[PDB]
Design a protein around this nucleic acid. Structure first.
Lengths: 129, 259, 156, 225, 212
RNA sequence: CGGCCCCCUGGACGAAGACUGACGCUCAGGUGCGAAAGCGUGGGGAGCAAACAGGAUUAGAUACCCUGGUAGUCCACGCCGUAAACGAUGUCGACUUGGAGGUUGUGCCCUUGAGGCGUGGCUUCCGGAGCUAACGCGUUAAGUCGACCGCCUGGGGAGUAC
RNA sequence: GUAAAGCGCACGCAGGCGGUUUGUUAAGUCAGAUGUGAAAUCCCCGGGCUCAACCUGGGAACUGCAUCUGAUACUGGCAAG
């Protein structure tokens, strides 16, 4: 059964990048939306678009720089089987700071740097590079 | 723009599948291959033997136009099925024209009954007939000057199997294959059938309304085993064959050619 | 200007009607002390000829690597067939902490400071290939900025 | 430079069947007509123009062009095109490693040249018959193989090709060496190795001729420049 | 031997036998490295030519692309930064610094001639400051010529020539829409002021009629 | 699991709608089904055939071959609980280029004809990216991921002893 | 898959995981504080034995536990969809 929506998102994105797909669509969720927004802010994607009322569909638009994809790597870290929660000091650095780590915090979902700046940790969703 | 889309549907509108629209201009001749271009993906490897008329020499130079045939695409590279088959549609149209006035008038010269019925030839092709049609009455053209010139007056046609019998004389006078498969049966009714593919044990001449014949390898000639059918007859040619044997059950009519 | 290191040389056999024909394989690597690196794997009946071939092959098909000053830009993994390799940027003075063929390629590359372990197979040929792969895929800050449509200070 | 109507007339828009296509060509395909792929001329034209411009630029800097077609239908035409702009060509079977293994083939060229000289300039006749027949045969072989590229000297600076799938060896060689590739690529073909792809009917003769003629004209222009 | 088997594109050889012999060479991008092959192991083959016909300062330059890259390559072995251009006689105006000019110029009558034939034409070694000095000696002159072009009032002319790049000397053939961004552009009049400059050119031709 | 028929009976798929409203996935222990051989009791017994007997072959022939031939194979009700019980590939879900078929639905289309254009289910082969020690797998993954379980830790001793 | 390793196949309790929206809670989670976490040992900056080992001042650390005050994105609970 479908158990982890976010991870499914990330896999879809990965597969689109692999296959040189322009855009990747999937059912929408708030957490998914926020993640997409974070990615856009962090520039791994061009733009995201949710559409629909009863069952809305998130549609991300993937990014390709000099042929190859932008999202070099994208992994979940927290997962239903095994959750990961980090305190602000302990927060990670993806690719020695070049990549990002999406982290959900009390004040919303943000990149690891942003969280560090804020002064708070939380659940580590995914690394992106 | 939609320029191109409109053109695509235009060019759809100005071509059809069969060999109907005389469009291919002969753009290279060499012996033994003619080639055309009828607005298809590729040029046709035409034989010279589709295009010599009734005495053995060529008739069309560069720029000349005959339609070919279609509905089969790319055996690996190329485009067509041959154009004389197109001529068969014109012959069918001429034969149908009879219906209008109940009399199609051509020359028809029938010397001898291949399969009971005299063979009647229209300009290039020669078709085979059922017995009665050669003569309106018991006149029997065997006493007429050999290969005589009258006309063809249609007595009988099979309407799915191209067997057409016509009346040479007497100007004044004017599932489906397998249930009743007893027409060409009795022992030895000879037929005019185009061969389709030679499978190195066979030739597969099969013309008479969705049947299959095999003149396989043993007769074919008067040598038995060293023969290799491709050397000895043809590809795609109408020949002498007769039944010799019918299964109506396991649909194996085993024709012969040594006759 | 280019420096060249023959990593390994190995005798390989071919059985024939008479007996065993022996030959020699030479695995070399060359580099200019900067980003640029290239390995070559030559073969000949005699050793010196085989190493000569290895040098020739290495000299062509070289590959560039984006070095932050003496070390790498971030931890990087690279694999090839059995040899799976981890290598990690390190502070000036630490030197090349790496084993075997891997070491050699790093030195010619002109990296001076790395912490580096070869997991899995340590078959010199495969492991050097894996190293090269890890070095190639490694991208720089400017490169990622360009990829992502940002400035370097935005990425830090 | 080359108009769309002319290309349509030639039969560029036609492309291979629908069981023989390549999904990397899906962008370049427009539709499928009578179970035959149609190439999108709208997308073909601009890129063809581009490719022409690049070829011209190459010519301007005194670049060496190699014209490859071994389809044996358009071998004559590719040779003619090469000669019109006095460039080089391979109209018969491409020798495996002609470019990568140039140095060996360079000897081959030299032997051919020597044989030609013997034939023509020496005027020495008086050769043992069988030996003379053998030398003649060798000459014919080498002319067939390396006739166009004999005056080439070194390695071309660009590579025009009539079919990618058919000449993939040449393409691969060009990629290994890094020579720019200018390929006519039908729907069945693989355009990944190609730098300046050209979606067009490699098979049809008139289309091939058209492709060649425009290329030759732009080479001549660049030379004039 | 690479050059012999068409692997080292060698165009001109602007060199002065008996002193310096610097020459650039191109190559088909295929991991060849032209200069490298010409040099060899620690100048292996370079030493051969060095003591070949006599002690010569042979040099090899990695030809990049076109004539623009040939300019700098002709200034080697030294440190070029920029250069000016023109039409038929472009006259590569070498732009370097005094400190690096010592080696760049090398000898008054040696590197000034050896690098002059490098491009085939001629070079004019200058200084970084010299460039700027001559650079400004050009902005004032499409203005520094008694203003014989358009002409109207002078108070508006100063504010117009402040923002005006390359004065107005034949500037109508350039973008005729960026001066309308200037604070003050009602009906096409400045687009007309440039037309006046064109008329001034015709007036200059009329002055040529006055003198021819 | 294979001749037809009838009676009782489980599942699958498609077509539209209508309803319920997360009721789901996986599963240690537990429970059930589980080829062939084998066991028990009672029936049956044509053919075949472990065992057995004779004839050959052979150095020998407790085999292969031949002639016979009993358990068994068949039925009923119990037990046994294992097989290279194999796709040597746990189950469920999602995503990622293609081609050629088979089978079984179903929508439209002049079925003008065996057809034309789609859209579902199951299924055979080839092959791309990717993966793989390679062989190969390749939208039915051995690719990219998630959930749960089972299992492995050098060869023998041993899947044996207690 | 072939190297050791997918139960012969299923159902299914316990257990593990759980679509989507809103509200609420604040258990998990995060932040801050307080209390404690003996000294010695380890590490940082210092000092003293001629140096060192050794001795030694101050810090840091002791990743934890308990409480109180917040945060509420995620996970959980409860209520409605």
């Amino acid at each position: 059964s479908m158990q982890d929506p976010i991870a499914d998102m990330l896999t879809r994105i990965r597969n689109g990048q692999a296959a040189n797909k322009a855009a990747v669509t999937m059912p929408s969720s708030k957490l998914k939306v926020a993640i997409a927004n974070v990615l856009k802010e962090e520039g791994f994607i061009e733009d995201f678009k949710v559409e629909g009322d009863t069952k809305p569909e998130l549609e991300l638009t993937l990014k390709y720089f000099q042929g190859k994809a932008v999202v070099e790597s994208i992994q979940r870290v927290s997962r239903p089987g095994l959750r990961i929660y980090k305190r602000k000091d302990e927060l990670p650095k993806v690719m020695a700071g070049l990549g990002i780590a999406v982290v959900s915090t009390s004040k919303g979902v943000m990149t690891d740097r942003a969280a560090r700046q804020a002064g708070l940790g939380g659940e580590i969703i995914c690394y992106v590079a | 723009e939609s320029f191109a889309q409109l053109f695509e549907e235009s060019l759809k509108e100005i071509e059809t599948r069969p060999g109907s629209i005389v469009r291919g201009v002969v753009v290279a001749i060499d012996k033994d291959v003619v080639l055309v271009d009828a607005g298809l993906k590729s040029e046709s490897a035409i034989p010279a033997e589709q295009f010599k008329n009734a005495q053995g020499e060529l008739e069309i130079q560069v720029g000349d136009e005959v339609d070919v045939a279609l509905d089969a695409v790319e055996d690996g590279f190329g485009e067509t099925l041959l154009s004389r088959e197109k001529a068969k549609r014109h012959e069918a149209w001429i034969t149908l024209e009879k219906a209008y006035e109940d009399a199609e008038t051509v020359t028809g010269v029938i010397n001898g009954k291949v399969k009971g019925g005299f063979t009647v030839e229209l300009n290039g092709i020669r078709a085979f007939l059922p017995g009665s049609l050669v003569d309106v009455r018991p006149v029997r053209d065997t006493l007429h000057l050999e290969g005589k010139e009258l006309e063809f007056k249609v007595i009988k046609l099979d309407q799915k199997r191209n067997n057409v019998v016509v009346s040479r004389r007497a100007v004044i006078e004017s599932e489906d294959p397998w249930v009743a498969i007893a027409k060409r049966y009795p022992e030895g009714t000879k037929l005019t059938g185009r061969v389709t593919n030679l499978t190195d044990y066979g030739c597969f001449v099969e013309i008479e309304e969705g049947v299959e014949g095999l003149v396989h390898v043993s007769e074919m000639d008067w040598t038995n085993k060293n023969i290799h059918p491709s050397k000895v007859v043809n590809v795609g040619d109408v020949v002498e064959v007769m039944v010799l044997d019918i299964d109506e059950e396991r649909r194996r009519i085993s024709l012969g050619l040594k006759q | 200007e280019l420096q060249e290191k023959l990593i390994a040389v190995n005798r390989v056999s071919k059985t024939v009607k008479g007996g065993r024909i022996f030959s020699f394989t030479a695995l070399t690597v060359v580099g200019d002390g900067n980003g640029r690196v290239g390995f070559g794997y030559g073969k000949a009946r005699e050793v010196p000829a085989a190493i000569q071939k290895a040098m020739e092959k290495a000299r062509r098909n070289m590959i560039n690597v984006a070095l932050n000053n003496g070390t790498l830009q971030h931890p990087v993994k690279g694999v090839h067939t059995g040899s799976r390799v981890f290598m990690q940027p390190a502070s000036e003075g630490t030197g090349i902490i790496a084993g075997g063929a891997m070491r050699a390629v790093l030195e010619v590359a002109g990296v001076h400071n790395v912490l580096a372990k070869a997991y899995g197979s340590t078959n010199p040929i495969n492991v050097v290939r894996a190293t090269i792969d890890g070095l190639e895929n490694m991208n720089s800050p400017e490169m990622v900025a360009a990829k992502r449509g940002k400035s370097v200070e935005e990425i830090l | 430079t080359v108009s769309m109507r002319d290309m349509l007339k030639a039969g560029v828009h036609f492309g291979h069947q629908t069981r023989y296509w390549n999904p990397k060509m899906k962008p370049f395909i427009f539709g499928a007509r009578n179970k035959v792929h149609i190439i999108n001329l709208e997308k073909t034209v601009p890129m063809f123009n581009e490719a022409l411009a690049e070829l011209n630029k190459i010519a301007s800097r005194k670049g060496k062009i190699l014209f490859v077609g071994t389809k044996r239908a358009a071998s004559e035409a590719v040779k003619d095109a090469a000669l019109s702009c006095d460039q080089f060509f391979v109209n018969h079977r491409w020798l495996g490693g002609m470019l990568t293994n140039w140095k060996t083939v360079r000897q081959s060229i030299k032997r051919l040249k020597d044989l030609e000289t013997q034939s023509q300039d020496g005027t020495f006749d008086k050769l043992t018959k069988k030996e003379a027949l053998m030398r003649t045969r060798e000459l014919e072989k080498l002319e067939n193989s390396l006739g166009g590229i004999k005056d080439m000297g070194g390695l071309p600076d660009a590579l025009f090709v009539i079919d990618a799938d058919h000449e993939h060896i040449a393409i691969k060689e060009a990629n290994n060496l890094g020579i720019p590739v200018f390929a006519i690529v039908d729907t069945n073909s693989d355009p990944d190795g190609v730098d300046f792809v050209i979606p067009g009917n490699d098979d049809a003769i008139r289309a091939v001729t058209l492709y060649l003629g425009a290329v030759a004209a732009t080479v001549r222009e660049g030379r004039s420049q | 031997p690479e050059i012999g088997e068409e692997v080292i594109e060698i165009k001109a050889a602007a060199r002065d036998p008996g002193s310096r012999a610097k020459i650039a060479v191109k190559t088909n991008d295929k991991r060849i490295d032209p200069v490298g092959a010409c040099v060899g192991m620690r100048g292996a083959r370079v030493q051969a030519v060095s003591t070949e016909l006599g002690g010569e300062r042979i040099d090899i330059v990695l030809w990049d692309d076109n004539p623009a890259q040939f300019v700098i390559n002709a200034m080697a072995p030294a440190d070029v930064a920029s250069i000016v251009v023109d039409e038929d006689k472009h006259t590569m105006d070498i732009a370097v610094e005094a400190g690096n000019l010592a080696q760049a110029i090398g000898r008054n009558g040696q590197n000034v001639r050896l690098a002059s034939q490098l491009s085939g034409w001629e070079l004019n070694v200058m200084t970084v400051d010299d460039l700027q000095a001559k650079h400004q000696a050009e902005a004032h002159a499409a203005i520094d010529t008694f203003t014989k072009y358009l002409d109207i009032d002078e108070d508006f002319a100063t504010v117009l020539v402040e923002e005006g790049f390359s004065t107005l000397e034949e500037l109508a053939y350039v973008p005729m829409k960026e001066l309308l961004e200037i604070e003050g552009l009602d009906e096409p009049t400045v687009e007309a002021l440039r037309e006046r400059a064109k008329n001034a050119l015709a007036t200059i031709a009329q002055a040529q009629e006055e003198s021819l």
